[PDB]
Amino acid sequence: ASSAVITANWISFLAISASFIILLVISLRYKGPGGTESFYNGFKEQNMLTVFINLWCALAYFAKVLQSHSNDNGFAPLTVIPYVDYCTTCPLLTLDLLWCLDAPYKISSAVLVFTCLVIAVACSLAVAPFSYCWFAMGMVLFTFTYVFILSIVRQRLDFFTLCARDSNAKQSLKHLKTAVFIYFGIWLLFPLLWLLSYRAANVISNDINHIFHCILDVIAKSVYGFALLYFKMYFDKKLI
Numbered sequence: 001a002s003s004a005v006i007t008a009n010w011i012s013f014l015a016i017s018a019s020f021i022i023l024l025v026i027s028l029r030y031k032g033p034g035g036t037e038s039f040y041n042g043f044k045e046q047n048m049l050t051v052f053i054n055l056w057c058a059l060a061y062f063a064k065v066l067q068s069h070s071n072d073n074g075f076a077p078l079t080v081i082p083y084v085d086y087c088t089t090c091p092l093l094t095l096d097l098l099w100c101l102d103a104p105y106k107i108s109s110a111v112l113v114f115t116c117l118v119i120a121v122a123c124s125l126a127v128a129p130f131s132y133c134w135f136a137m138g139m140v141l142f143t144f145t146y147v148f149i150l151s152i153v154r155q156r157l158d159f160f161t162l163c164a165r166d167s168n169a170k171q172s173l174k175h176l177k178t179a180v181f182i183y184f185g186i187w188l189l190f191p192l193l194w195l196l197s198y199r200a201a202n203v204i205s206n207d208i209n210h211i212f213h214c215i216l217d218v219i220a221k222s223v224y225g226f227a228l229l230y231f232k233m234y235f236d237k238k239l240i
């Protein structure tokens, strides 16, 4: 691979590894809002989802780093077949988002995201013009999923803001809004990147697409999980 590609892969792998190790340490040391439960997150494993996500992401990038230094394909599921790592991660991200917000249809939303990602995987491994049909079907399903998840997220954000008066509550709400903006705005770029890649309109080269994918992953995973975590710890739920 090119110097830029290997450098971006190494930077992304190191960033996600550091983020995973910090999130795991914080989760293990977290003692709950009361500061008395030794294993608060042990009996609430959903709070660990973020951590696992990062770990999986890190592993994926590790494989990429190996593929960056060898002429032969590395771990095919995480390097060869596109969007499989996303198939594994993004549904967990949606589940975590709708769990911290106590939103309805969290499992339904996660399954919809998984189905959209599997449709995308089929589209990326298809041959034109059938690839266009797969992309159109995925686009309709993702439009429906995006509208549904936004409607739930907006209604939970309004509910949370209605009963958030403490300064710490306001700070946690700002972090939650930052995480929501990262989740919604950034996710819209992935379809734009696919439609702008060598597939369909070939304008952006492979290297720039890969670097943009790495940056979007790093942001929308590391910063997203950190914000979610700031919000979960520093937002009193009993204010409902």
Ligand SMILES: *C/C=C(C)/C=C/C=C(C)/C=C/C1=C(C)CCCC1(C)C
Pocket (backbone or CB within 6 Å): 083, 086, 089, 090, 093, 116, 117, 120, 121, 123, 135, 138, 139, 142, 187, 190, 191, 192, 194, 217, 220, 221
């Ligand atoms: C950490 C990585 C994440 C959250 C990746 C998310 C990716 C998507 C939401 C991708 C969506 C796509 C479509 C809606 C259309 C087909 C092409 C995709 C896979 C880019």
